[PDB]
């Protein structure tokens, strides 16, 4: 059948699709990302993300872990700067107790102090594993230098805050952001009815709108990290459109025109205007792409470069110059059509998997409360037109930039030189 | 209610298999029964280096214009090579189904290997290998394959030794291409929003030209000691049954029971009537022996004291797994290509569920005693592995004096 939606009177969104899949997936989406902290409770969302297997009012940690592993199901937590999503999946004959476990974890945690004291070492280990690659550190640095208050908060807990996060901070964060008006329960392979019954036994008691977050403010700037890596990583972004505008579609078409990942293994990603503009001048190994991260109040669009330290300068300059050409109208309609085809194929392959489909429905729910059929999107992406793309470009080419660099930065340029 | 995988056969022997579904994007791939097992130590990197050269232009589509085409529809182009199979797959939209198939046809035949490119891809491959050593678990699994299949074509790696890489020429490649790319050893697999009749007509139109034409495990040990590395990776395996032996399913349930070292992963790698069944763990030096002891105890417990509750848990973990996988188009196509290459047919999920539910605790401990108890393992260690026990202690840990 099709997707089916009810908005409960306490604000909770219920979305269901019954496709008679053998494994069914049920997720719950909360607007409780890392942007809702301030300077007093930094890293609380990271410990909340890692604290999904703790003792709840209704099931202990042992009961939750052994009961999910007894049926072979999976419980995972994915977190962005805006949203958290707790997802369980398993056989249709065990999803009743899977919803019991998931809704107990979402609605009634206990946050015992010895459990979080044991979890803080796992927090340090998870942060080290996450920052084992340079892209994660340079994106966290880029957000920290790009924003002032809200989106500048890191996804991972700072080093000083480990050992300082308490049970009361987790309880305050849950009581202020895990309310029914910020939650959507999305189920693929389940009946809509059951979602509702579990949405009344749970998800209905906490029904405020919660604590409203601050508006994110752009700051500009640049933070660098000399650490002696073999490759220089550099991200240069500017403020862009937010979630809910056609200029966001223009910026997505702009990154697929500039280059948003290789389609061929071992390809040179020939088309990418960026990749072409770098490769016509530099014979060193490189990786140049376009970065776009848009959240419900603000967006970041820019370029991302990995290169040899020595060439790091002009490669960045070459990439920047290519965007300036797009800001001068130097583009062809066939290139924009190919960018639109790449963007729509990427969207359809993102929603072709079950967990990606459940995430998409989830995101749409929290964001606009409505489901937008894949088809609808296709025609809206088509709405973006050439001039629109050019426009977004000039926004990037003019707006104050924010630069995060890491590596041997002896030949990496600055923003006033860039 | 899962749709069946329908298989047809052209005169060439290229089985064209497809499994339609609602999703509007598809994963169309070509699976070839050609890997490092079919190489004869004089062309040990031919499949890998051809896998590098296969996207650098054909005769009809010279150079990057070819990949410009796969950029033009926004499709994704991937390829991989194992010791037994080679795959070239494209993720695209449904409406771009013909041209994608035509693109795949060029990639398997009419391919062009430029001498210029050969030197460039040699430097790529050489350099990657020169840095591949960085990935320890790959080093440990290559060491395990070498010491377990000494003297056979299953010991040699997919990449080959730098030697061959440097010493390779178009003609050699041409041979591997003209020898191991036969039409009866090829499967055109499609998953997602595809019609089987349209795909069969496209395979008849293009790809209808493809020409029509003792594995041994040695209980042994390789120890690469390098004390400057921070962590140690150790893999211990025994001989697996192969693709066609059904107790693999039972062995998978046993792996689902196991699921002390920072990282502990169980594997059941299967090749044509052989394989490696075991565990790989990555640990600090001062823990290694204890891990090994732990691990061996679990294996002997599965040989001696398997209960119904852990068997039920392993069956649930296996069911969920196979069904969690086989979800997105690619994962599926991949399964269609491997199923037509290995089993000769696509095994449906209902047959997998029947073979899972027939597994109980008694036959699990019987099959585990058949494959784990009192067997000589292959051990591959890399890192600070001085406290890793030698072969007598591991071999003695492969059985219990109390049974």
């Amino acid at each position: 059948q099709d997707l089916e939606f009810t908005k409960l009177p306490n604000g909770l969104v219920i979305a269901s699709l019954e496709n008679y899949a053998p494994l069914s997936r049920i997720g719950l989406f909360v607007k409780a990302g890392s942007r809702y902290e301030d300077s007093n409770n930094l890293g609380t969302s990271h410990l909340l993300r890692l604290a999904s297997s703790l003792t709840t009012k209704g099931a202990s940690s042992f009961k939750i872990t052994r009961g999910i592993e007894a049926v072979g199901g999976k419980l995972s937590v994915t977190a962005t700067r805006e949203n958290m999503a707790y997802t369980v999946e398993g056989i249709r004959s065990d999803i009743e107790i899977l919803m019991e476990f998931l809704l107990n974890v979402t609605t009634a945690p206990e946050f015992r102090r010895w459990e979080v004291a044991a979890l803080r070492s796992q927090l340090k280990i998870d942060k080290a594993v996450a920052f084992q690659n340079s892209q994660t550190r340079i994106i966290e640095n880029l957000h920290d230098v790009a924003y002032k208050n809200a989106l500048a908060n890191p996804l991972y807990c700072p080093d000083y805050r480990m050992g300082k996060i308490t049970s009361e901070e987790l309880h305050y964060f849950v009581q202020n952001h895990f309310t029914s008006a910020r939650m959507a329960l999305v189920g693929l392979g389940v009946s809509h009815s059951v979602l509702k019954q579990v949405a009344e036994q749970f998800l209905n008691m906490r029904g405020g709108l919660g604590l409203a977050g601050a508006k994110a403010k752009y700051r500009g700037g640049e933070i660098r990290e000399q650490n002696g890596d073999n490759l220089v990583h550099a991200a240069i972004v500017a403020e862009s459109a937010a979630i809910g505008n056609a200029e966001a579609n223009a910026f997505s078409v702009l990154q697929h025109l500039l280059g948003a990942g290789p389609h061929i293994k071992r390809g040179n990603n020939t088309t990418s205007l960026l990749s072409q503009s770098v490769a016509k001048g530099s014979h060193q190994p490189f990786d140049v792409s376009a970065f776009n991260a848009s959240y419900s109040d603000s967006g970041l669009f820019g370029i991302y470069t990995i290169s040899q330290a020595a060439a790091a300068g002009e490669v960045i300059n070459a990439a920047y110059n290519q965007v300036k050409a797009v800001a001068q109208g130097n583009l062809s309609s066939a290139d924009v059509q190919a960018a639109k085809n790449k963007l729509k194929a990427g969207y359809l392959m993102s929603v072709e998997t079950s967990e990606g489909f459940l995430s998409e429905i989830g995101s749409q729910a929290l964001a606009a409360g409505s489901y937008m059929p894949p088809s609808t999107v296709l025609q809206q992406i088509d709405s973006v037109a050439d001039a629109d793309v050019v426009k977004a470009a000039k926004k990037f080419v003019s707006g104050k930039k924010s630069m995060a660099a890491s590596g041997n930065l002896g030949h990496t340029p600055f923003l006033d030189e860039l | 209610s899962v749709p069946e995988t329908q298989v047809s056969i052209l005169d060439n022997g290229l089985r064209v298999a497809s499994e339609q579904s609602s999703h509007a994007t598809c994963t169309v791939g070509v699976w070839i029964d050609a890997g490092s097992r079919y190489e004869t130590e004089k062309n040990n990197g031919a499949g890998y280096f051809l896998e590098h050269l296969a996207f650098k232009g054909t005769k009809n589509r010279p150079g990057n214009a070819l990949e410009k085409e796969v950029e033009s529809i926004g499709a994704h182009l991937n390829a991989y090579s194992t010791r037994e199979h080679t795959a070239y797959l494209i993720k695209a939209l449904s409406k771009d189904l013909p041209k994608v198939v035509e693109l795949l046809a060029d990639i398997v035949q009419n391919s062009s290997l430029e001498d210029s490119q050969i030197e460039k891809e040699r430097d790529v491959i050489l350099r990657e290998m020169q840095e591949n050593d960085a990935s320890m678990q790959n080093v440990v699994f290559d060491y395990l394959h070498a010491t377990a299949f000494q003297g056979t074509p299953l010991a040699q790696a997919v990449e080959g030794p730098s030697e061959n890489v440097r010493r390779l020429s178009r003609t050699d490649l041409t041979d591997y291409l003209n020898r191991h790319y036969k039409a009866p050893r090829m499967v055109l697999a499609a998953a997602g929003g595809v019609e089987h009749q349209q795909l069969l007509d496209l395979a008849q139109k293009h790809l209808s030209s493809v020409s029509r034409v003792p594995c041994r495990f040695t209980g042994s040990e390789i120890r690469h000691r390098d004390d400057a590395l921070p962590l140690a990776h150790v893999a211990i395996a025994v001989e697996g049954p192969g693709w066609a032996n059904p107790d693999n399913v039972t062995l998978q349930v046993a792996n689902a029971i196991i699921g002390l070292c920072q990282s502990f992963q169980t594997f059941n790698i299967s090749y044509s009537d052989t394989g490696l069944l075991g565990a790989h763990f990555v640990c600090d030096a001062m823990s290694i022996d204890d891990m090994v002891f732990f691990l061996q105890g679990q294996w002997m417990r599965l040989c001696t004291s398997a209960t119904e509750s852990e068997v039920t848990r392993g069956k649930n973990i296996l069911r969920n797994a196979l069904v969690s996988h086989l979800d997105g188009t690619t994962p599926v196509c991949e399964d269609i290509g491997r199923s037509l290459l290995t089993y000769g047919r696509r095994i449906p999920l209902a047959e997998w569920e029947s073979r899972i539910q027939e597994v109980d605790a008694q036959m699990l401990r019987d099959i585990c005693s058949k494959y784990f108890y009192d067997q000589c393992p292959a051990v591959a260690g890399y890192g600070p592995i001085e406290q890793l026990p030698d072969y007598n202690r591991i071999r003695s840990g492969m059985f219990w004096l109390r049974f």
Binding site: R49, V77, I306 | -
Partner: peptide, 30 residues
Amino acid sequence: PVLDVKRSGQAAARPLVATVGLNVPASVRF
């Protein structure tokens, strides 16, 4: 220090999304 269990080069072009849970795997994607 050892980063627990050590191991991408592909440059990020999309926002990051941490991922952890009961299952042993845990990582981030752009």
